Structures are given as structure tokens and as C-alpha cells.
Amino acid sequence: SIVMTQTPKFLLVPAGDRVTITCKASQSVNNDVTWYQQKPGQSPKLLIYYASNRYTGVPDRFTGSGYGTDFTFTISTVQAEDLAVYFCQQDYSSPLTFGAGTKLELKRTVAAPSVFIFPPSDEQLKSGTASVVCLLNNFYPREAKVQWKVDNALQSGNSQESVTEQDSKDSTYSLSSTLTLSKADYEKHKVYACEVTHQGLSSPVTKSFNRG
């Protein structure tokens, strides 16, 4: 079958700057190519059909070009809400094949995280489990490292992390770290601390609480 190759896989562009996404085919497809754009948690949306024509209601800033084997998708002025992943599709011969997809990101400036920690709830303690949650917000870049300390003793193998999709409100990352401990182990210690190291911090940032 006909196979699309779409490059670059990850593309970075500042807000308000032009960006172009390329597409290459394996055989002549004349003018049967389409482009799709998808938000996280939302269905893909069609932008370009016939590889050079905007679809009804598509903003003028989205354009496409190419014929035969090399096809390009171009955005004249990227917006803050344009954070999405773009796919190409051929409509010449069945089966219709989708491209590998290309993700578009915004740069912005470097920002330091603000750290919060949440103590285990009384309801969870009734079930015999204790969980400590650490919250990080509005930090760039994504490489934020989190470490947990209980009574100044480092913890490993009992924590998990989760990063969001860089919410388009301010194009910054957020990370949450959860430490899972048993109720019996929780009662054996007094001080619970989490250490955060990030590019925007000149020194590690420590938040602590006393509960026990």
C-alpha cells in the first residue's frame, strides 16, 4: 500500500511565527491528499482538502501546497491555541493511509516552578493507606526532577509522576508527584519533605510538613 512519510516528527516554533510541515509519498497521487489537526482530548479536524484548498470555515492562516510526491502544510502565523498534532492522508488508492503525525510546540521563556505539597487525608487513613501529593505549576522546561525525603531519609521505588499537556492558557507545564506509603509506615515518622530541582532554580527547593 501507499505509505506517507511526514517530517519533522517534533517541530518547535515561537508564537506568531510561520511554520511548515512536509509530507512525502511513495508514488504519484496527483492531488488526492488531505491534512488533519487534532487537539488533546478532542477529535481531529480537517483543514486542507485536495492538498491545496482550504476547507469551509478553516482560518486563512492555514495553507497547503504540493503535487505528485512532495506536499507541504504551512501556517502563516501560529497562535497560542495551535498546539496540536498534524497528520497527512492520501485519498488516491485504498486503503487510505495516514501519516505518522507531527507535533507542534511553542517555545516561550524559561520559568521556575512553584511547589506545593498536600498531606494525606483523614478519609484515606481510615483505609490503612497514606498518600502524599506534590504539585508543580507553570514551569519551563519540562525536565523537572522530584525527590522525596521522609525524616531526611531519601525514598525510592514508591513514587510516581505525571505531566500534563502544557495547557494552552499560558503554554507552561505542570507536574504532580504522589508518594504512596502504608499507614503503619506513615506513623513511624514525623517530618515529610519533597525536594524539587529544575533549570529555573539556582538551588533545590524544599517543602516540608509535620503530621504525626
Binding site: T34, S94, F98, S121, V133, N137, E165, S174
Partner: protein, 221 residues
Amino acid sequence: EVQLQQSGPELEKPGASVKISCKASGYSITDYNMNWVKLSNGKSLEWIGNIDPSHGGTTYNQKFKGKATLTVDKSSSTAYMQLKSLTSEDSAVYHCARSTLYGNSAMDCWGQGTSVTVSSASTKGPSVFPLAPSSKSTSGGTAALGCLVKDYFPEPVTVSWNSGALTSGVHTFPAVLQSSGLYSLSSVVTVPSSSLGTQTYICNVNHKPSNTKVDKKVEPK
């Protein structure tokens, strides 16, 4: 203008079968070709097949032929897709799309997507817990508060604050899968500290597979 309505998520045993549905409104179903798209791990689109209700003809992608069956109901303006012998590779989100009958086949309208999960762990309901910023050093500046959703399966879970109010400043984190096979999720919201003692914040958690609805209040302690 044009709406495509799909069913909720499914959770079947290995080797089972599903029959999802796609309801179309705002246009005549016979006037547009309709197809399904598979999203492998949510990062790679795949074309499954299409059906034309105008003549009943069906076209299936070769590696999906036989494994899937497509049918339409013109009386109800609803179309159905069936999968045979579900395997872990089939666990993906399936979307319904609308396209022209003849000429171009560009997919114009998309549904909200139906998630099909091949059960690798038993069904379980979420446990909602409050996250109180207070009872600590200090709640400087704005006070960030949230809720903890732990030990639920399968995905997804919907979290809302104040019955859909206070949309701004809400951060819902992606779920994390534990060694026990149970997902865990955390959602937080940033509010001014001056409203800690004069405002009520309530988180709504809904889990369709277990039909669990929890409305937990978050207050300082």
C-alpha cells in the same frame, strides 16, 4: 450543524465481541460516506473501513477485513461496527467520520470517540480523597487545592469542579497505571487564599464503567 454521537466506553473479556453505534443528525445519512478510524495508542491514525448506506456496499482495509464487520440502519440513521475475537492489540479509541460518497473521501465531521478496552484487570470504582493545602507552613499567595482519584479501572474518569463552574485555573493530570492494574489520577485548582474561609469548593468525579458518582468537598484543615 452536523453531529455524530457515539456510545460510551466498553470493557469486554479477551476474545469477546462488541457492536458500537454511530448516530448521525443534521444531514441525510445516504448523502455522505461514513467510515471508522482507529487510533493506535492515541498517536497513530489508522483507516479501518467504510460503508455506503445508499447501496449497502462495504470496503474494508485488508488487515481489518474479517476481523471487523460494518452495517448500517437507514430507518434509525444509525450505523454499527462489530469486532471479533478482541485482543490486547485492539485496545484503542475508535472514531466515526463522515465523507463524500463519490470523488473525494476527505473526512469532514468526527465524533467524540468510543474507547474499547480489553479487560486485563477487574473492574473497580474510584476512591475520591481531598487534598487540603492547609495544616502546613502557610498558604502563601493563592491556595492550590485538589482531589485524589485512586484505584479505578478502566479509563476514562471525568473530574469537574463546582458542577462545571470555575473552569479557569483547573489542572487535571493524566492517569497513572499502577502495578495492581488500577489507574490513579489527580486534579487540582488554584484559588485565592482569601476565599478559603468564605467559599465552598466541590469536585465532581464520574466513572461510567462502575457507575460511580462522587461529590467531595475540599476544605482547609
